[PDB]
Swiss-Prot record:
Subcellular location field: Cytoplasm
Family the entry assigns: Belongs to the metallo-beta-lactamase superfamily. RNA-metabolizing metallo-beta-lactamase-like family. Bacterial RNase J subfamily.
Listed name of the protein: Ribonuclease J 2
GO cellular component: cytoplasm
A single GO molecular function term of this UniProt record: zinc ion binding
Residues reported in the UniProt entry to bind Zn(2+): 72, 74, 140, 162
Gene that encodes the chain: rnj2
Shown residues within the full chain: 4 to 446 of 557
GO terms classed as biological process: rRNA processing
Record text on subunit structure and interactions: Homodimer, may be a subunit of the RNA degradosome.
Length: 440
C-alpha cells in the first residue's frame, strides 16, 4: 500500500484582485503550505504604511501548516513574513538570498524570536508526509528566484512566483528551462502563474536593450539624476551602476541600503571602486556628476519621490533642473500617487525622462512569456494569480490559447477555495480573507 493523496485545496489570501501581497495556501490532505507572504503598499487609505494578508484561516488550522515557501526576496513575496511569524511558528524555506533578506527584516523590527530558516536551491527536495516539494530557478529582477513544485499523486502543483523570460539575463538570473520541461513532461495538475503583464502583447524588452536606452537617456541629462525604483530591482540597480561608471557619475543611495549591503557581501553586484558615495557627500559634487537611487524608507519608491518633489524629504529634496527616471511598473493601487507625483515634479521644475514607446520594461512576463510557461508546463488546471481581475482574465485567455481546457481555468478572488477530490475541481467554499492595515 503506497500513500496516495485524496483532497487538494488552493486558496489565495493575497495577490488576486491586486498585484502585490502574494500569499497562496495549498493543502494536500492534512498538510498545509503557504506560498509567499507579501505586502502591498497602501492605496490612496489614510495613515497606513503597509497592508498584509489576513491569515485567520491559517491560524484556525495552524497545526497543519508545514512551511512558508518564499520565491524571491522582494516585498511582494516576503513583506508580511515577520508578521506571519508573530502569529504562527512554521519553517521558512527560500533561496540563500531570500533567507538573508528575511533575517534583515526580522532584525529591522527587533524580533528576536527563534525562526527555523531552511535554505533551498534548485536541487533541494523537501519531503513531508503527503508530498515532496522541489524548486526550479526562474528569471526575475532579483537573483536566486525560485518556482515551487508540490508533487502529488494527481501530478504537480506549480507556483511560478513572479517571473519573465529574457535571454540577456544570466548567472543567478538564468531560468531552469530543462527542469521546467521535465516537470511539464512528468505531469502538472495545476499551474499557479503571474498575471501582472498578461494584457501586454509580445515579450518584455530585453534588459540589454533597456540598459542601452538608459545609457542614451542618462547621457542627455545636464544636471542631477534621480532614479526611482524598488530596492529589490537588482537588475536596474546594476544597470545604473554600470552607466554611472561610463558617464563619470557617482552613485548614492537614498533609502533604508540594507538589501544592497547584504547582496554585495554575498557577491551579487559588480561595483567599480570609488563609484558609491554617502548621501551627505552628494552636494559636494557638480550636479552633473551624481545619480541618486531613491528606493523609499519603507521600500516604496514613489512615496519617497513625492516627498522629494514637495521638498518634504528629511534628507534630500528635488531642485529645479533635476531629471527623474521612474523605473517602476504602475498598478491600479498606485496610479493616483504616481499621477500626483509627476505633477509635483513638473511644478518643481524637474524633468521627467519620457518612456520610450519602443520599450516595455517590466519584471513580469508579457503574453508570449506567459505562453512559454504554459506550453512548458502543460497544466491540466490553471489558476492565474498576481493580478487585478482584468489581468487574471487576460492570462486565462492565454491559457485557453495554449490548449488548457476552459472549464479547467479558475478565476478566483481572495478567500475562494478551489478544491479537488480526485473526481471534480470545484469552487464552492470561501474562507476569511482581507487586508490588514499596518502603521508605524
Ligand atoms: Mn517581484
Amino acid at each position: 500500500i503506497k500513500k496516495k493523496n485524496k483532497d487538494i485545496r488552493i486558496i489565495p489570501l493575497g495577490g488576486v484582485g491586486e498585484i502585490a501581497k502574494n500569499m497562496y495556501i495549498v493543502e494536500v490532505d492534512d498538510e498545509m503550505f503557504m506560498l509567499d507572504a507579501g505586502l502591498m503598499f497602501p492605496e490612496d487609505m489614510l495613515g497606513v504604511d503597509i497592508v498584509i494578508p489576513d491569515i485567520q484561516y491559517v491560524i484556525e488550522n495552524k497545526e497543519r501548516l508545514k512551511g512558508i515557501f518564499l520565491t524571491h526576496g522582494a516585498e511582494h513575496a516576503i513583506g508580511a513574513v515577520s508578521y506571519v511569524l508573530e502569529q504562527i511558528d512554521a519553517p521558512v524555506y527560500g533561496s540563500k538570498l531570500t533567507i538573508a533578506l528575511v533575517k534583515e527584516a526580522m532584525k529591522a523590527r527587533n524580533i528576536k524570536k527563534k525562526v527555523r530558516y531552511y535554505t533551498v536551491n534548485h536541487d533541494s527536495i523537501m519531503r513531508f508526509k503527503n508530498v515532496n516539494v522541489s524548486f526550479f530557478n526562474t528569471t526575475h529582477s532579483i537573483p536566486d528566484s525560485l518556482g515551487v513544485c508540490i508533487h502529488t499523486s494527481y501530478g504537480s502543483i506549480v507556483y511560478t512566483g513572479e517571473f519573465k523570460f529574457d535571454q540577456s539575463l544570466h548567472g543567478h538570473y538564468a531560468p531552469d528551462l530543462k527542469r521546467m520541461a521535465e516537470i511539464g513532461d512528468e505531469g502538472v495538475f495545476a499551474l499557479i502563474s503571474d498575471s501582472t503583464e498578461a494584457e501586454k502583447p509580445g515579450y518584455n524588452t530585453p534588459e540589454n536593450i533597456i540598459e542601452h536606452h538608459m545609457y542614451d537617456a542618462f547621457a542627455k541629462v545636464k544636471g542631477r539624476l534621480i532614479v526611482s525604483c524598488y530596492a529589490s530591482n537588482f537588475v536596474r540597480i546594476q544597470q545604473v551602476l554600470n552607466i554611472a561608471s561610463q558617464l563619470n557619475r557617482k552613485v548614492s543611495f537614498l533609502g533604508r541600503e540594507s538589501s544592497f549591503n547584504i547582496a554585495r557581501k554575498m557577491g551579487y553586484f559588480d561595483i567599480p571602486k570609488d563609484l558609491l558615495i554617502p548621501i551627505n557627500e552628494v552636494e559636494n559634487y557638480p550636479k552633473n556628476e551624481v545619480i541618486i537611487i531613491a528606493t523609499g524608507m519603507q521600500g516604496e519608491p514613489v512615496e519617497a519621490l513625492s516627498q522629494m518633489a514637495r521638498k518634504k524629504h528629511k534628507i534630500m529634496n528635488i531642485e529645479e533642473g533635476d531629471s527623474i527616471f521612474l523605473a517602476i511598473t504602475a498598478s491600479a493601487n498606485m496610479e493616483v500617487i504616481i499621477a500626483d507625483t509627476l505633477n509635483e515634479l513638473v511644478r518643481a521644475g524637474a524633468h521627467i525622462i519620457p518612456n520610450n514607446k519602443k520599450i516595455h520594461a517590466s519584471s513580469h512576463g508579457c503574453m508570449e512569456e506567459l505562453k512559454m510557461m504554459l506550453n512548458i508546463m502543460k497544466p491540466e488546471y490553471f489558476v492565474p494569480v498576481q493580478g487585478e481581475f482584468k489581468m487574471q482574465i487576460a492570462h486565462a485567455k492565454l491559457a485557453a490559447e495554449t490548449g488548457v481546457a476552459p472549464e479547467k481555468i479558475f478565476l478566483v478572488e481572495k478567500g475562494d477555495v478551489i478544491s479537488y477530490n480526485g473526481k471534480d475541481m470545484i469552487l464552492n467554499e470561501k474562507v476569511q480573507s482581507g487586508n490588514i492595515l499596518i502603521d508605524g
